């Protein structure tokens, strides 16, 4: 019961990546502003599958 | 006059990758500039993910 985003990523790792890249996570998750999320940023390349 | 080499390059830095990330950071990356042969590699998302 430690997964997120309907994928294999744990809440810990997702939280750490989002905090490291967008300063997001201590005040609720949400899609970061586009200008903060460049081509090599985290969220853009995240792709859950099932 | 003085052959005091002003470029001290190590083999630990990855200057190529550094410039790759800088070009993404400061400006848009999608657009193509022919002069520097500036055209970032990319796959078709309907091929990477079916």
């Amino acid at each position: 019961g430690y997964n997120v985003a309907q994928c294999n990523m744990t809440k810990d790792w997702f939280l750490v990546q989002m905090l490291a890249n967008y300063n997001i996570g201590y005040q609720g998750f949400y899609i970061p502003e586009s200008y903060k999320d460049r081509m090599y940023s985290f969220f853009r390349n995240f792709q859950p599958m099932s | 006059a003085s052959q005091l080499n002003a470029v001290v390059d190590l083999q630990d830095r990855n200057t190529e990758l550094s410039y790759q990330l800088l070009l993404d950071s400061i400006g848009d990356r999608t657009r193509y500039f022919s002069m520097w042969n500036q055209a970032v590699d990319s796959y078709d998302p309907d091929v990477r993910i079916i």
Binding site: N21, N23 | L22, I26
Partner: peptide
């Protein structure tokens, strides 16, 4: 001092 020239009318890898 140099106003006669003016027209008249840091990034490290992270930092959010």
């Amino acid at each position: 001092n140099f106003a006669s020239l003016a027209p008249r009318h840091t990034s490290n890898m992270s930092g959010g």
